[PDB]
Design a protein around this ligand. Structure first.
Ligand SMILES: CCCCCCCCCCCCCCCCCC(=O)OC[C@H](COP(=O)([O-])OCC[N+](C)(C)C)OC(=O)CCCCCCCCCCCCCCCCC
Ligand SMILES: CCCCCCCCCCCCCCCCCC(=O)OC[C@H](COP(=O)([O-])OCC[N+](C)(C)C)OC(=O)CCCCCCCCCCCCCCCCC
Ligand SMILES: CCCCCCCCCCCCCCCCCC(=O)OC[C@H](COP(=O)([O-])OCC[N+](C)(C)C)OC(=O)CCCCCCCCCCCCCCCCC
Ligand SMILES: CCCCCCCCCCCCCCCCCC(=O)OC[C@H](COP(=O)(O)OCCN)OC(=O)CCCCCCCCCCCCCCCCC
Ligand SMILES: CCCCCCCCCCCCCCCCCC(=O)OC[C@H](COP(=O)(O)OCCN)OC(=O)CCCCCCCCCCCCCCCCC
Ligand SMILES: CCCCCCCCCCCCCCCCCC(=O)OC[C@H](COP(=O)(O)OCCN)OC(=O)CCCCCCCCCCCCCCCCC
Ligand SMILES: CCCCCCCCCCC1=C(C)C(=O)C(OC)=C(OC)C1=O
Ligand code: SF4
Ligand code: SF4
Ligand code: SF4
Lengths: 176, 110, 43, 314, 156
């Protein structure tokens, strides 16, 4: 149930001693290492051609946040603040009120993307699949406050990526 | 004469590239920098061992200087004496290396 | 039910031991080749 | 007309050093299962040009130097010596055909430690000075086996003339009578140029870290000129090619292919090994290479006498 | 005019040479170092863009702040930033370097590295993937490509 790495006694007959001396004087293991490096020289490299070739992602991937809608245009978020209660970094800021048709909707849905730990506890706390963490990972900004998303930005990310988000949820909702 | 021209050309091209490398980015007006090391201000502690390896280099380099006329000395007609003195010089360099060994002179830079 | 499972007979065997495949001549043979190269050069 | 010959020596030196950086990045790429530069030019052929233009407009690092004069002199000396090591090289005809070209190269390479020493003292960093002293001690250590191996080989040549070394190897490569000298020579040239696994100026500060991007690039290109030069010298010395005097370009193609393969062998050794500790390559020199080198020097003195194979003087 | 054309072409040349030979100094502070190492790994391979792996801080062109910046190390970050030769850029990688992140309300964390150094590219994630960091590096190259140093110099 255990083994001994490096508890070998080398043989002391003249054959093995001359083998070790040919190793010492003729650099045999150094030629072995050069052979392995030469062997990778003639392999096809593993290098993909970014940005034209992309790293393989799964439908579970946790990238940029998006507030989703129903198939009527009504936003799914009914202001229940479960996502900001579960949010481990307190990135989500929510304020709500009844709007003009009496519906329970948010007036503030902020996510600080520089507090966010991208763990997706918000999209699994969400009872109506409103907040999701979509598939976009290429959204680097030049300014810090461009990573401070309000409700308008998140609803626009939903409208932007919904054709992809719905299919990813369609792939993974039977595991959830 | 061609050697002196070649040395002057190599030295002039080196000095020209060093002048360009020290004065082409001086033309920019980048910014003044205030800018207020593993040792902070401790004086450089002397190593006896670096001096000993440099002196061992110097003495073996003198023995090499003695060894350098051997490709000419093999052409002599007193070959027994020449071979004896060549083997004696390389043997005395080997005895110098052996004494440098056995009195622990080649240690911690072995 | 449909769940991520191994196949019916399981997966095949997986190598996990050391394989340094022991290549090269003997020490006697390598010193013989080196001394023979020296003798050809000297001749 | 001779000045044209000097320029056609030393401008292709700078171009070959420029593209050696690309070849190193590409070959080290594919040996590390990745690619090297292939975006900047087609197949990355504009990477050295882009990098030269980047380094020559980077801000000067502006050090406080202990000496301004030696801080200027160390790149000048490095580039001058790295360009003058090429002029006796018979490929098939040297620029300067001199009778003692081997000893000339050994002397001008022995002078190359002053650039390291002067740049280390010209910096105000004491740790940079310690690194410079370690690099100088390493280089002067391996110069001993350079001189003695080189003497033991030229005992088969007859003279210090580099062009005679082609005549010496017309029937056989000189690596056949002197492969132990060749392998200790090759590792000693690997340790002269501070090349991996002997690069302790990148093992955890370099002697030339206080220089700006321009002058450090000049040190870097002097180092790669030394690398290509020592590979050409090792090719001339142990792998001497066929030379038809009516068709000199056959020798030029042949030594060029062999010197390229030997420079790529430097690139392939740095893609394979960890570094030595400093005392370990001191142990490699003083306790391993130097006793074998003295023993083989005795052997290559006594061997042309005992076989009646003393080479001619002329 | 002729002078505007000449300084435009020289701007294009020097911006090409700078964005095609970016040398990074990576502050491997925390978990984002692992993903910078994956951006150097053979799948993504920053070295084919001319972006070398681990240039020394006194020759690097861009400081990738990859990890959490604590209060005990913020003067070391600023000292390495002050030792970089110009033009120097700063990529902020990941949430703790961007805004404090999961340690934003901590007593010992600098709430974003932009309180310490000026920042050019904010690369979001915890960690951002190696592909997302390589996206940020290519966006930094695009930011260098549209610089107008000599055109503004000629117009001043
Ligand atoms: C052979 C190896 C390679 C050779 C070297 C590389 C080839 C190209 C060399 C010339 C490139 C252009 C000039 C250097 C780069 C200037 C970059 C820069 O920041 O310029 C701003 C600087 C300063 O502009 P500034 O006034 O905006 O200063 C910026 C800094 N502040 C505002 C804080 C003060 O421009 C210059 O110094 C102009 C230099 C001359 C312009 C070109 C002349 C013709 C060259 C041929
Ligand atoms: C320890 C020294 C051992 C070797 C001594 C010299 C051996 C040798 O070959 O000598 C012949 C050589 C040369 O002899 P030779 O036989 O070649 O002389 C022929 C004449 N010439 C030189 C013109 C060609 O030296 C001598 O005979 C005299 C010099 C050495 C005398 C002994 C010194 C001993 C010192 C001890 C302390
Ligand atoms: C010029 C073209 C290329 C030339 C060949 C080189 C290509 C291969 C290069 C591979 C990469 C090497 C990278 C650097 C390696 C550094 C480490 C290393 O190898 O250290 C050297 C190693 C050091 O060994 P070590 O340090 O591992 O050994 C332990 C030593 N002690 C116990 C002291 C700690 O070996 C040598 O020093 C040997 C040098 C060459 C010896 C050649 C001997 C030839 C045979 C002579 C005769 C033998 C029989 C007896 C007499 C018979 C008479 C009939
Ligand atoms: C001993 C031999 C030594 C050889 C050393 C050199 C080796 C490498 C040789 C070069 C390899 C190919 C170079 C190709 C350069 C890129 C050309 C290009 O496509 O540039 C595009 C760019 C913008 O073009 P644009 O018109 O805007 O594109 C929109 C089109 N709808 O347009 C531009 O950028 C403007 C044009 C720039 C052209 C630069 C060309 C390369 C310069 C190489 C210098 C060395 C040449 C050889 C010297 C030795 C032989 C004499
Ligand atoms: C009077 C008018 C002239 C005034 C003075 C100017 C002198 C000539 C300077 C060079 C030519 C000017 C234009 C410079 C490039 C402008 C166009 C450009 O940037 O094109 C981009 C294109 C590659 O596109 P990229 O943005 O990199 O896209 C990434 C790939 N997805 O880029 C390319 O395709 C390659 C661009 C290469 C740039 C030219 C080649 C390098 C410079 C060679 C000459 C100088 C250096 C000589 C050697 C120095 C030492 C090695
Ligand atoms: C800090 C200062 C600056 C540092 C950077 C620059 C200096 C360092 C780099 C250059 C070094 C210069 C070396 C000059 C002499 C080299 C030795 C030499 O001349 O060997 C070649 C050759 C000997 O061979 P052989 O064939 O026998 O002679 C011709 C007979 N047919 O002999 C000949 O061909 C003889 C040719 C005529 C005599 C040439 C004399 C040269 C000028 C004097 C020395 C110049 C260097 C002084 C400074 C040294 C370094 C500080
Ligand atoms: C006269 C000037 C000729 C061009 C300059 C030398 C050729 C370009 C080398 C660029 C370079 C590379 C690739 C490089 O990787 C490197 O870092 C180790 C350098 O040192 C700072 C370099 O200089
Ligand atoms: S992914 Fe996690 S840290 Fe980010 S908003 Fe959702 S719950 Fe908060
Ligand atoms: S996004 Fe979901 S969890 Fe958050 S307040 Fe809206 S409905 Fe509730
Ligand atoms: S942004 Fe996240 S993964 Fe990155 S260093 Fe911070 S805690 Fe670690």
């Amino acid at each position: 149930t255990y083994k001994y790495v490096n508890l070998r006694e080398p043989s002391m007959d003249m054959k093995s001693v001359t083998d070790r001396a040919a190793q010492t004087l003729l650099w045999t293991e150094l030629i072995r290492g050069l052979g392995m490096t030469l062997s990778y020289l003639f392999r096809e490299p593993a290098t993909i051609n970014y940005p034209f070739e992309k790293g393989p992602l799964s439908p579970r991937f946790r990238g940029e946040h998006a507030l989703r809608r129903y198939p009527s245009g009504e936003e799914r978020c009914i202001a229940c603040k479960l996502c900001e209660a579960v949010c481990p970094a307190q990135a989500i800021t929510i304020e709500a009120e009844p709007r003009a048709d009496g519906s329970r909707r948010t007036t503030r849905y902020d996510i600080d993307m520089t507090k966010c730990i991208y763990c997706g506890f918000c999209q699994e706390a969400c009872p109506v699949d409103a907040i999701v963490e979509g598939p976009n990972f290429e959204f680097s900004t030049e300014t810090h406050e461009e990573l401070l998303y309000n409700k308008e930005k998140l609803l626009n990310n939903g409208d932007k990526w919904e054709a992809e988000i719905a299919a990813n949820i369609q792939a993974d909702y039977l595991y959830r | 004469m061609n050697l002196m021209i070649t040395l002057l050309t190599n030295f002039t091209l080196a000095t020209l590239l060093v002048t360009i490398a020290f004065w082409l980015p001086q033309l920019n007006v980048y910014s003044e920098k205030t800018s207020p090391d593993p040792m902070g201000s401790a004086r450089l502690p002397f190593s006896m061992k670096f001096f000993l390896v440099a002196i061992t280099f110097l003495l073996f380099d003198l023995e090499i200087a003695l060894l350098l006329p051997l490709p000419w000395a093999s052409q002599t007609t007193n070959l027994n004496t020449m071979l004896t003195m060549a083997l004696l010089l390389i043997f005395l360099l080997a005895v110098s290396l052996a004494y440098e060994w056995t009195q622990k002179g080649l240690e911690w830079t072995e | 039910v449909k769940q991520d499972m191994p196949p019916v007979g399981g997966y095949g065997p997986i190598d996990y031991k050391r394989n340094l495949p022991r290549r090269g001549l003997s020490g006697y043979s390598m010193f013989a080749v080196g001394i023979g190269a020296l003798l050809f050069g000297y001749w | 007309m001779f000045m044209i010959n000097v320029l056609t020596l030393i401008i292709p030196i700078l171009l070959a050093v420029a593209f050696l950086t690309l070849v190193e990045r590409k070959v080290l790429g594919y040996m590390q299962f990745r690619k090297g530069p292939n975006v900047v030019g087609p197949y990355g052929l504009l990477q050295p040009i882009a990098d030269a233009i980047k380094l020559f407009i980077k801000e000067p690092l502006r050090p406080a130097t202990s000496s301004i004069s030696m801080f200027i002199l160390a790149p000048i000396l490095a580039l001058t010596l790295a360009l003058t090591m090429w002029i006796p090289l018979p490929m098939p005809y040297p620029l300067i055909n001199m009778n003692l070209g081997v000893l000339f190269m050994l002397a001008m390479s022995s002078l190359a430690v002053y650039s390291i020493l002067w740049s280390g003292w010209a910096s105000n960093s004491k740790y940079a000075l310690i690194g410079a002293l370690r690099a100088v001690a390493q280089t002067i250590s391996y110069e001993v086996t350079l001189a003695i191996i080189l003497l033991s080989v030229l005992l088969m040549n007859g003279s210090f003339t580099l062009s005679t070394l082609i005549i010496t190897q017309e029937q056989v490569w000189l690596i056949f009578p002197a492969w132990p000298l060749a392998m200790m020579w090759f590792i000693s040239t690997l340790a002269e140029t501070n090349r991996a696994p002997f690069d302790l100026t990148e093992g955890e500060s370099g002697f030339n870290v206080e220089y700006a991007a321009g002058p450090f690039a000049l040190f870097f290109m002097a180092e790669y000129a030394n690398i290509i030069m020592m590979n050409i010298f090792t090719t001339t010395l142990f792998l001497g090619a066929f030379h038809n005097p009516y068709m000199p370009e056959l020798y030029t193609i042949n030594f060029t292919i062999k010197s390229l393969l030997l420079s790529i062998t430097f690139l392939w050794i740095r893609a394979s090994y960890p570094r030595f500790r400093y005392d370990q390559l001191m142990h490699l020199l003083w306790k391993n290479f130097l006793p074998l080198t003295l023993a083989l020097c005795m052997w290559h003195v006594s061997l042309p006498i005992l076989l009646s194979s003393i080479p001619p003087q002329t | 005019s002729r002078g505007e054309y000449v300084v435009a072409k020289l701007d294009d040349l020097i911006n090409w040479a700078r964005r095609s030979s970016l040398w990074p100094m990576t502050f491997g502070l925390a978990c984002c170092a692992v993903e910078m190492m994956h951006m150097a790994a053979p799948r993504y391979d920053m070295d084919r863009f001319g972006v070398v792996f681990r240039a020394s801080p006194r020759q690097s062109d861009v400081m990738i702040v990859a990890g959490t910046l604590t209060n005990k190390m913020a003067p070391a970050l600023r000292k390495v930033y002050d030792q970089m030769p110009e033009p120097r850029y700063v990529v902020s990688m990941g949430s703790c370097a961007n805004g404090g992140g999961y340690y934003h309300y901590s007593y010992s964390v600098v709430r974003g590295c932009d309180r310490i150094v000026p920042v050019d590219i904010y690369v979001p994630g915890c960690p951002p993937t190696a592909e997302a960091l390589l996206y940020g590096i290519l966006q930094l190259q695009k930011k260098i490509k549209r610089e107008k140093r000599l055109r503004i110099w000629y117009r001043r």
